[PDB]
Amino acid sequence: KENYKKFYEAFSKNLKLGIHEDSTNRRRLSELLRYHTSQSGDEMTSLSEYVSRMKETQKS
């Protein structure tokens, strides 16, 4: 992960284009996505990690 953040900083745009264009890979390509969130402070967390903190009542 200490290198992954350098790779993602350089090649994030290509990685997004894969989600736009590859209907086959995208389910697996999204797992490589990182975002800021209100509760992730100044760090980016994966969408799967987001669920780990998801409230019992959230559907979305």
Site residues, another protein (CB under 8 A): 2, 39-43
Minimum CB–partner distance for residue 6 and another protein (Å): 8
Shortest Cβ 32–another protein spacing (Å)? 19
Length, in residues, of the chain: 60
Closest approach of another protein to the CB of residue 20, in Å: 28
Q: Which is nearer to another protein, 11 or 22 (CB)?
A: 11
